[PDB]
Structures are given as C-alpha cells and as structure tokens.
C-alpha cells in the first residue's frame, strides 16, 4: 500500500524498498517526472473528438 | 552476499556481483522480514500476539 493506497507494481515496491534503505529517495527532476506520469495516468483513467466534430460541422 | 563459490571463476564472480548489485541480499532479507511482520500483524487476533517486533 502506497500513499494513495493503490496496489503498486513490484518495480515500484522495490524502488520504495531501496529508497527507504538508503534513507533518501529520487531527485527533484525524477520526482517531477513521476508526478507528471501519475497525473497523466489519472487523466487517462478519468477518460477530444467532440471539439473536432463541432469544428468540422462548420464548412 | 551469501553465495559460496569454490575456486575463483571470473565469469561466475562477475555475473554474481552483477545480479546481487546494490546490497540485493540485504534488500531481499529486509523484504522477507517485513512481509513476515506484516502477515503476523494482520492475523494477530487468533495468534494472541501482544508484540511483534524485530531486534536491532
């Protein structure tokens, strides 16, 4: 169980293991990339052709 | 690590230290001990477990 409680992949579990073991996590850029990936996954789970159809309706 | 080798074999030695890189033995030991602790804590009712800890 992670902070959000979702079932982590074993790779993420080992990443958490090693981060706890060394006493420190990833860098700032890596954290930004991870949160961007999480936001992208959340947006994909929540789901652009309607706008295209509306635009194509006009000649 | 805890792999005993008889006779120096450079290929096996380098392959083993690649596989067990970054304290992998300690990592798997910590993983198994944490999994055991969590499992014991989850079913602590029927086991009459008062304290389930690990030494230093």
């Amino acid at each position: 169980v992670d902070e959000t409680g979702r079932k982590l992949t074993p790779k993420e579990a080992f990443r958490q293991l090693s981060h706890r073991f060394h006493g420190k996590g990833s860098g700032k850029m890596k954290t930004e990339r991870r949160m961007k990936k999480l936001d992208e996954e959340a947006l994909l789970k929540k789901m652009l052709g309607t706008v295209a159809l509306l635009q194509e309706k006009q000649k | 690590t805890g792999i005993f080798m008889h006779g120096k074999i450079p290929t096996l030695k380098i392959s083993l230290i690649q596989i067990f890189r970054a304290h992998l033995w300690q990592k798997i030991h910590e993983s198994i001990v944490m999994d055991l602790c969590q499992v014991f804590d989850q079913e602590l009712d029927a086991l009459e477990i008062e304290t389930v800890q690990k030494e230093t």
Binding site: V1, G23 | E30, E55
Partner: peptide, 22 residues
C-alpha cells in the same frame, strides 16, 4: 480488510548507530 503502510529500516548512510534501528 486493509493494510497500513509498511515501514523499513535505513541501514545505508546512517551514522546514528552501528546496528540498524528498530
């Protein structure tokens, strides 16, 4: 059925004690 977060020991780069904290 729920599982509380799992803690771990930071043995690496820890000068607080020779033995791992518990």
């Amino acid at each position: 059925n729920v599982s509380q977060k799992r803690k771990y020991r930071q043995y690496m780069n820890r000068k607080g004690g020779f033995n791992r904290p518990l």
